Each structure stands twice: as structure tokens, then as C-alpha cells.
Design a protein around this ligand. Structure first.
Ligand SMILES: *[C@@H]1O[C@H](CO)[C@@H](O[C@@H]2O[C@H](CO)[C@@H](O)[C@H](O)[C@H]2NC(C)=O)[C@H](O)[C@H]1NC(C)=O
Ligand SMILES: *[C@@H]1O[C@H](CO)[C@@H](O[C@@H]2O[C@H](CO)[C@@H](O)[C@H](O)[C@H]2NC(C)=O)[C@H](O)[C@H]1NC(C)=O
Ligand SMILES: *[C@@H]1O[C@H](CO)[C@@H](O[C@@H]2O[C@H](CO)[C@@H](O)[C@H](O)[C@H]2NC(C)=O)[C@H](O)[C@H]1NC(C)=O
Ligand SMILES: *[C@@H]1O[C@H](CO)[C@@H](O[C@@H]2O[C@H](CO)[C@@H](O)[C@H](O)[C@H]2NC(C)=O)[C@H](O)[C@H]1NC(C)=O
Ligand SMILES: *[C@@H]1O[C@H](CO)[C@@H](O)[C@H](O)[C@H]1NC(C)=O
Lengths: 109, 49
């Protein structure tokens, strides 16, 4: 996890080869590509409660809000298993209104 | 690690709080105090210099 100790990018793995009086390291790394821009927010307010992502960021495609993982764009809908709650929505700078979906009660019809 | 991708600075500070074991609500609920403390700490360096 040391930055730039095993090449440029996120180190995946490395292979050694012998040279005359030396060694050659072939570093395999992961390099992110083809980014898009989005709107973002730190928390989400629902029922007077602030919701934070468990892992990921809240992003908006223009009209809807999703959670994604931070390094590869893979959007999902914001549920109570995606997030955790802390406090009320009066203290966070930049909080946004949206609905956080519960699975249990629409299972219970 | 590649191309520069923008992110707002308080959200970068929250990632970094996660990286030491503190949840990020602790940053967002203290943002103003944390920024005051950083500013006083930076203002103390030029005084010693
Ligand atoms: C943002 O993504 C959503 C996808 O959830 C698009 O909204 C539509 O949402 C309904 C119900 O959620 C789906 O049945 C549709 O298939 C979605 N797409 C369309 C084209 O109707 C929404 O269009 C996206 N917004 C932008 C600006 O890209
Ligand atoms: C990001 O910065 C913009 C300014 O560029 C902020 O927008 C202003 O919001 C205030 C309310 O606090 C309004 O009175 C101003 O009229 C807005 N200005 C513009 C140019 O839109 C925005 O609130 C900031 N975002 C956050 C999360 O603080
Ligand atoms: C997000 O939703 C909340 C919930 O209603 C909004 O809070 C209201 O804000 C208006 C204007 O600031 C007040 O007149 C109401 O009294 C508030 N309602 C409650 C129940 O407190 C909040 O304004 C919404 N945020 C945005 C940006 O529209
Ligand atoms: C955590 O520590 C900080 C000290 O940096 C406290 O904030 C200070 O509180 C004193 C009260 O004695 C104020 O006079 C200062 O102005 C505060 N500093 C800043 C930068 O706001 C804070 O109260 C402490 N929190 C708790 C829960 O004890
Ligand atoms: C994102 O938008 C900015 C302008 O706000 C633009 O300069 C940048 O090239 C865009 N990047 C992508 C991936 O769309």
C-alpha cells in the first residue's frame, strides 16, 4: 500500500526476473480510466435524520441519488443497509433531501 | 495514481478520517472546529519561523 514503491497506480502484483548482476521487477498495477463528473453530497436527510454512506459516496446523475463505491462507478439505490444514521439534519454543511428505502416494511405489505 | 479527479475538500478530509479509524460523521459534525484548529496550527508555524 506504499505509494509508488511498486510502480505507478494501485499495486496488484509483481514478478521478478534475473539480469546480469541485477534484478528486474515487472510491476502489475491498476490504473483508473474514463471518468465522469457527478453532483455529490456528504449526507442525506430523511425523517429528520442524517444518513451517511457505509462505504461509497452519494452521487447524483442529474435527478436521482445513488451510492457508489469510490473507485469504480457502480450505482445502487440508497437503503438502510447502504447507510448508517447519526444525529439530525441541522449540523452538516451541504446536506440534501432524499428518501432512504427500507426493505422490511415493503416486504410486510 | 492516474488522472486528477476532483472531490470537495471536506469530503476528502472525511475519507482521511476514515483512513485512521474514525467515522466520518465525526468530521462532518465538527467541521468548523477542525478547520479553526488547522488554521491556528498553520498560523503558529510562521510565527516560529
Ligand atoms: C438517472 O438515472 C435514472 C435511473 O434510475 C433515470 O430515471 C428513470 O427511472 C425510472 C424509474 O426509476 C426507470 O424506469 C427508467 O428506466 C430510468 N431512465 C429513463 C430514461 O427513464 C434517469 O433518466 C437518469 N437521469 C439522467 C439525467 O440521466
Ligand atoms: C458552494 O458555493 C456556492 C457559491 O458559489 C454556494 O451557493 C450559495 O449559497 C448561498 C446559501 O448559503 C446563497 O445565498 C448564494 O446565493 C449561493 N451562491 C451561488 C453563486 O449560488 C453553495 O451553498 C456552496 N455549497 C455548500 C455545500 O456550502
Ligand atoms: C429538506 O426537507 C426539510 C424537511 O421539510 C426542509 O425543512 C423545511 O425547511 C423550510 C425552509 O427552510 C421550513 O420552512 C420548514 O419549516 C422545514 N420543515 C421542517 C419539518 O423542519 C428543508 O428546507 C429541505 N431542504 C431544502 C433544500 O429544500
Ligand atoms: C474539544 O476541545 C476544543 C479545544 O480545541 C474545545 O473547543 C474550545 O472550547 C473552549 C471552551 O473552554 C472555547 O473557549 C474555545 O473557543 C474552543 N475552541 C474552538 C476552536 O472552538 C471543545 O469545546 C472541546 N469539546 C468537548 C466536547 O470538550
Ligand atoms: C467535468 O466538468 C468540468 C467542467 O465543470 C470539465 O472541465 C471536465 O472536463 C469534465 N470532466 C468529465 C469527465 O466530464
Amino acid at each position: 500500500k506504499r505509494v509508488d514503491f511498486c510502480g505507478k497506480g494501485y499495486h496488484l502484483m509483481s514478478f521478478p526476473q534475473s539480469a546480469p548482476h541485477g534484478v528486474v521487477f515487472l510491476h502489475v498495477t491498476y490504473v483508473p480510466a474514463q471518468e465522469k463528473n457527478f453532483t455529490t453530497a456528504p449526507a442525506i436527510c430523511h425523517d429528520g435524520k442524517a444518513h451517511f454512506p457505509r462505504e461509497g459516496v452519494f452521487v447524483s446523475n442529474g435527478t436521482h441519488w445513488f451510492v457508489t463505491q469510490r473507485n469504480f462507478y457502480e450505482p445502487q439505490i440508497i437503503t438502510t443497509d447502504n447507510t448508517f444514521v447519526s444525529g439530525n439534519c441541522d449540523v452538516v454543511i451541504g446536506i440534501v433531501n432524499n428518501t432512504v428505502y427500507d426493505p422490511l416494511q415493503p416486504e410486510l405489505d | 495514481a492516474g488522472a486528477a479527479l476532483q472531490i470537495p475538500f471536506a469530503m476528502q478530509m472525511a475519507y482521511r478520517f476514515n483512513g485512521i479509524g474514525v467515522t466520518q460523521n465525526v468530521l462532518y459534525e465538527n467541521q468548523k472546529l477542525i478547520a479553526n484548529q488547522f488554521n491556528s496550527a498553520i498560523g503558529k508555524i510562521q510565527d516560529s519561523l
